[PDB]
Subunit: 329 residues, 6 copies
Amino acid sequence: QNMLDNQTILITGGTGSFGKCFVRKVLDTTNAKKIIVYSRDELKQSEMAMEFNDPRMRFFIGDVRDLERLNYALEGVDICIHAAALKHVPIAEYNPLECIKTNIMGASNVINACLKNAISQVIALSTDKAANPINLYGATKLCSDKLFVSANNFKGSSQTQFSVVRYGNVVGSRGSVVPFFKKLVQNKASEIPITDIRMTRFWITLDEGVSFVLKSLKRMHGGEIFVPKIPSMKMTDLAKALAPNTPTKIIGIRPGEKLHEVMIPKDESHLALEFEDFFIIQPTISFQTPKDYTLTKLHEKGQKVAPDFEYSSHNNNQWLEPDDLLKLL
Amino acid sequence: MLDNQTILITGGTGSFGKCFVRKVLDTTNAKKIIVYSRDELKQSEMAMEFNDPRMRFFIGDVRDLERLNYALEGVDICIHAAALKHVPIAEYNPLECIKTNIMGASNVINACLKNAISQVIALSTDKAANPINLYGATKLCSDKLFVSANNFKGSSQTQFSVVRYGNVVGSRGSVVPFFKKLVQNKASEIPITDIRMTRFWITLDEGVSFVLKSLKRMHGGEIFVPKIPSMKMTDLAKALAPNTPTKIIGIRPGEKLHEVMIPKDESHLALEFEDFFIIQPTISFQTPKDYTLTKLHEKGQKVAPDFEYSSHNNNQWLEPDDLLKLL
Amino acid sequence: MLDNQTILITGGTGSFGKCFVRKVLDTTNAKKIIVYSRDELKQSEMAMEFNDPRMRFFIGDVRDLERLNYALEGVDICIHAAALKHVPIAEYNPLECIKTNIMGASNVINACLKNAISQVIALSTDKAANPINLYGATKLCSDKLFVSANNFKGSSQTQFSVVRYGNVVGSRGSVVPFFKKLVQNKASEIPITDIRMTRFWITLDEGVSFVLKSLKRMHGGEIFVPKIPSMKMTDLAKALAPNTPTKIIGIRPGEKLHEVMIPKDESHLALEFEDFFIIQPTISFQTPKDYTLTKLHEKGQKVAPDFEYSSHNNNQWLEPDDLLKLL
Amino acid sequence: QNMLDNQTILITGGTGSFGKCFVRKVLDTTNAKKIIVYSRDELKQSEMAMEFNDPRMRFFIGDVRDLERLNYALEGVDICIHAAALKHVPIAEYNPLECIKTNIMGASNVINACLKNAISQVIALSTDKAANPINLYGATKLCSDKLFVSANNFKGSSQTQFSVVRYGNVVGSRGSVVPFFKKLVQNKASEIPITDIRMTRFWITLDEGVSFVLKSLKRMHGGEIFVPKIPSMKMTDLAKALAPNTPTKIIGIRPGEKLHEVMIPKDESHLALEFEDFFIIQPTISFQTPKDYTLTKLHEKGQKVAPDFEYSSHNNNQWLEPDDLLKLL
Amino acid sequence: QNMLDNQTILITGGTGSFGKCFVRKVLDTTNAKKIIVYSRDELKQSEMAMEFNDPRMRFFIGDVRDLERLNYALEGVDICIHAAALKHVPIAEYNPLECIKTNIMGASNVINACLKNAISQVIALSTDKAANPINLYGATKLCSDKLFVSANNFKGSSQTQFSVVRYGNVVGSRGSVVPFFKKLVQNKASEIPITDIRMTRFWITLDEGVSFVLKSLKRMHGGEIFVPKIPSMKMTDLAKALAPNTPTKIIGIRPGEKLHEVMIPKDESHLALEFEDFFIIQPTISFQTPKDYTLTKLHEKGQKVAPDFEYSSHNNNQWLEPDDLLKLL
Amino acid sequence: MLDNQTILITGGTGSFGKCFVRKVLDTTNAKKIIVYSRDELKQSEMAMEFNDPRMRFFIGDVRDLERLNYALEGVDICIHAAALKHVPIAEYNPLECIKTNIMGASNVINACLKNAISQVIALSTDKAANPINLYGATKLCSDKLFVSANNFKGSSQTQFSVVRYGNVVGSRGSVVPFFKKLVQNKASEIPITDIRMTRFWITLDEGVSFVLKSLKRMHGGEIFVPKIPSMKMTDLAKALAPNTPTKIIGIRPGEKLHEVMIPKDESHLALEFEDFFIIQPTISFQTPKDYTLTKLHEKGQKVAPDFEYSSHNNNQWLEPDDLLKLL
Ligand SMILES: NC(=O)c1ccc[n+]([C@@H]2O[C@H](COP(=O)([O-])OP(=O)(O)OC[C@H]3O[C@@H](n4cnc5c(N)ncnc54)[C@H](OP(=O)(O)O)[C@@H]3O)[C@@H](O)[C@H]2O)c1
């Protein structure tokens, strides 16, 4: 109970959606000694510092592309949550090397810095877009995930543990559908923009993911890809609940966009382990000091899966009717 | 076409490289063919076996931007075949694969723009479509960089394209070859990872050929995919081993049962031709291109909504006897 | 002037950037306006609010020389407004401010010379005159690099100048704005660091305007300083808060009571004009320039020996009522 | 008494004016175990090695712009005196990036290397030109000073202490006024070069600064800017003492040159602390482990100053008539 | 006896001639805990892994030009054998910077990484071509040798020992004379290619050098250049034994090629120490913690040499008639 | 020749540098002479002693590729004399010597090709022939890089050559000078490392002269070696000290008894001329050159099979009296 007290925590990209929520959640429910925000923008950092005004907060201006900076930033840290990233899919397609340096090289430097300072546990934030990806963004994340899982071999001094938490779309996420679908029904417009008519997506909220990351910390062994069992949803209904009775047009599919987001690839189901509310995709490689992922640090037992499993926002065992959506801003 | 043209090929000492060089020397009027790779052993041996004035050997690494800037001086066409492709080794040495495949792509691109190369073609892999293993992910990033490189318009308009296809028959240290050592060593059985395991098949010479056709029709920005046949590994074993039992083992670190060539989610960007496909860019260039009409004036048509080129839902297959014919 | 010209502005998503872009789109025939900054969030939002074909968004960092070399290809004019300007945060993250403000200046300069840009203007600050805080020191180094860059004469003669002025009224997260939240939140008092605290005032639009005039008259090597009015913070509080007491607090980490625009020690290098000043270079270029006569044929005269443009010994002031008028 | 015995000392730019004098002063008056000279030029190093021929001397060829080199050079060092620099003001104006890489980046690498090797104390040499500067040289030094003072936060392992010692013009300093004013009155020339007629400067000697640095070591807490109370002087008299009865011309003010050098800025007087023979400008930032700069390591008590103080070679409470000057070569 | 058990060994360029042989020799005759192969090519690594299939083998894909990679690769290593190199003389002449980055910079990074991880002993492979060299290859190796010998000064934490083993031509070495002279007499060709008629070379076999390296490990103090007393041979006879009765032509001298390879330079004989079967060329510099190279770690006593000595494949006290050659493939 | 030409010399503040600059200013119509070195002290002093408009001083390090790219803009000829030459100090600081001598060579070369310099001459040393000490080894690598640089043929054909010769009489801090302090300080004896110690001798002015002739005759790829006399150190001591005993000490860290100029193993690549030698490249360039005929139409002949230019088997010697004449 409370396996995070007196710990110093560093979170890259702490000024973002997840970052701000996660930090709030840690200051409010744990006796963590210190929380360090690591990000580049001075504007967002000065405002987040006023927004929080907490003595246990520390802010480091820095780029994850900068190995030397991370080395100093992680000095004394026990836990690192890595959320820094360039996630705008269509912008990543026009600015590929940018997305690559931040997400892939960024992951490398963070891993490097965490080993040098002997951090204890590291959780990297992945995305559903990183499974059987088609867009660059998702490919960088897949590479990112691979680096973090692979980092569990290096048994130098202390044994830093690296795990990955993968989930998708976050409701109302700044710049997402909800925010725009809230400016449509609102600012009179008799036509709701729609890409496809079969378009669906996994949906989870900021707080759910945050809470999920914390629980993942409490049970990780290191090497896991944690996937939460979340409900699917068709964009048609997100345009009915968040849009009473208004017509809809069609602008076709956007760049490197899927119709359905995979969560647990059919090609890797033989590695997945089911649990009551989450999954564990085991390493596709073998470590020197292997672990049994069937028994979390929280004794939660895991079951294997059908050799033809494919967790997708398409064949999910649960959905969310319109009215449910409205039950959240 | 290539007469009086200087061509540089990274990874020139590899399986594709040697076949490509051999084919260029014999069928074009290329003035100079440059091999750019790291091994002095392979290059001296490739120099002895290719004793031709048209060759020139450069020792260099694609991870070295300065070296490439220098090697690409005066080059008209660049074929990028340098890579780390061993999937398992890539899972264990992930950063090495990333440095070579992704940063290497970026450097090659940089050096080509600076030296004002006319055309560039990077070799992709079917493992880059909806990838699940690291190697494939790095190639997908590579392909993306190359397609994206076409938004530059400084000195001369450098064109970048990608040629994607799967496993090459007999390929230096692959299934078929080392499999023959099996049915040749009296082996009481043949190793088979799975029964429903299928794969696309193309010969080393066909790929080289396809790369050369792609050069003749490219506008810059395409991912050329050749129409090739699939094949169940069930029959590949019962080809090199007509009479031998199979040791149904398991799946390797990052293998898939079926390799994708053109994803369903990208189908809409596809265009069918008689012999191949073109997956259109996902981005809009400062200057539009009409990929429905090649430089060879070939017309291509869109594909059905939920189309997909997989090694399992393919209509062209290669049975036992059909194999031998190659090697 | 700017018709059919390509303009690139670093830090294009900032307060100055957006105003400058808006002003360029509306008043010139610029063919293409390029925003170069790091945040995808701000750029996508700035793209939605500026839905114009003349725009182009590049994700990049000024600390990245390779990225700039690429972004500046084909650019005619470069406005450098990228920076880390939060003084306190600069005192705590000194190396970050140095990397962005100084190394960033050096890279921008390098990329401009290589791409043969015609004119470049970097935004300085009054905190760079006789500086006492790190941020200001980095800008002074920046300004020096830019002025010095004019000794190059390779391909095309690239001109580098500097535009220096102080605090911008209402500026995203500054005194005035957040101060209104005060007199708006019934606050029983207004935070005042000191009583004799004065500062120069200029509007976001005036600065943008001044930058554009500077482009029209620059020879390359000047530090253009606009004639703007000072203002006691005593009256700024008694403007947004006609009836509210002041919480006379203390001085922030690296604040000064009065900001200098033109130092006394540099007075001799100054030249007065009707609307502004030009602080002449401190070095002699391979090719002399006569800064007493702009490209707009405006004549400027020297100033008195021990002259000095301070926010305290200024003859132009902005009283309470005078403020509101802006925001 | 003698809080420097058995210590290994490294001094960057040890082949310079201060360097050579400081090294002499340390070999002669302390039982320091070893003194390492860190600089680039082989000529000056081979000659300094013959000039000293001391077994406790070590010479490392290296550039302060080279982080890897410093890392190895500082291995085993207890104290680092940082005197390497590009100080020629007019040359720094024509070669700005050069001055920036050596003085600013140089300071960074030295700080980095000192932390990695867990040095105990570090003293950086500043200049009066770094206060309310106008020339690039002075701006780089101001940046340099800022980095060294800011380095006292990092409480990793050991607590390396970083302080700055700032003073100005050194009499007869190679290439200074004295050396030229000694070639004038000498090599017949009926005209002494003069910039301004109100020109003044703070004056101190090599030995005084050196001794001042050593004493600063004995009392520093880390984070201080030590300023010695030194006498001012008008260039007119330096042209009378060092020049009997000879006329004088005027070549105006040189590049980025001041008429008067500030030592303690009016804008920062509220941070200064007076002592019997020196001042302490406290950090403009707050550290995690704050110190009371009113009581040196040598118990010397400090007094605050008038909120309108401005220590300048203009309003100094002491000057140096011609005859005094002659009392020194 | 067996001063190598339970040790973790890393060998750069382990996929080469020496590498493969050395690894075989270590797995077969020592209780070394682990052997790490460090090299770039995935092809040669996957095949060497099948060729050995030993659990005590580890393979790291990496470049010696990459300092960060070596740092991680040497983590936990006790002994490093450095055999990675670009040795093709004529290719090094056309690709000089390539040879320089691999051999010289490569040596530096390996030394750097070995110090950071506190390895115990390091042996670098040199060549006879590095003594009084004329070709670039040999010059890089000379530089390489110099770095490794010079690395014995740094007395940071543990005292890593660096020695160099220098010998020349290896019989039948892939791509050497034997392999081609085996394709001549073989594949009918009435003319054997010959450069000069006085051409001679030192000859040793793969196994001899390997064994020599291991024994060098057992007796090194650190700082030595070990040279084995090996037999000379004239290329004329290598063309009689490996070529019964066939004529011979002359293609003159190839690029940067010598007629005779020096082993122990006349200019350095005063540093050499003779032993029953090997020599020791002492450091041309003095270390802080000097050693007596006259008494190996194996008590083997060494004798000085004549101040006019010149060990060359020209004045050797032993040769190898044709028939002897045939006694080896 | 050099009229209206811009010349840049690295290590321009050194013994060779100053003499070379002085000689260029006085005997050519060079439009601009650029000194590129690191010390501000030496450069300001060299500026005061050389108060000439034709000079220009750049502070820079040869280890800095970016700095060189900039300094070499607009340069026609480059003389590379920057180096770390103190043999003992090189043995103790091996990586520093390597960075300056080898990487420095590579950067100078890179910057020259990019800025399209016409001719480049790097100063080598006799310690680079069959070297035994680190300094010499680094120079041999340097020479190799320079000779090899001639295989480039991008924009303009840049020519790279090498000038090699030994110890310079009186040289700032060498044998002769500091030796005079001896016979001047009444010293009861003179330090002599060995009795059979010989060395080549050339004056500072002769070397400079030889470099200028080399520029006039070079094709690019040569190592010019001047015919200079040897000298026993036995007589050099009995010159500055007619009446003084010798303290027969020992050999320094990396000394040789006799310095080689042209190795026996390279003899075959040599060519004799009236006043000098040319050691031909060891590699074949994309475009052959006939080094038997200079640009000054001088004819050179091969040398005897086992020829070798050593300071011991030389036929030209400098006796006691012969020395004084210089210094
Ligand atoms: N050749 C002789 O007869 C001989 C005689 C005496 C001494 N030696 C010395 O002994 C050493 C080994 O010689 P060898 O005969 O075993 O030659 P080899 O068969 O060419 O082995 C060299 C190995 O080094 C690896 N390598 C090359 N560049 C590398 C780099 N940049 N980073 C990491 N690994 C690299 C190569 O593996 P990858 O291609 O997979 O990178 C190659 O397998 C050499 O240093 C040589 O100087 C050789």
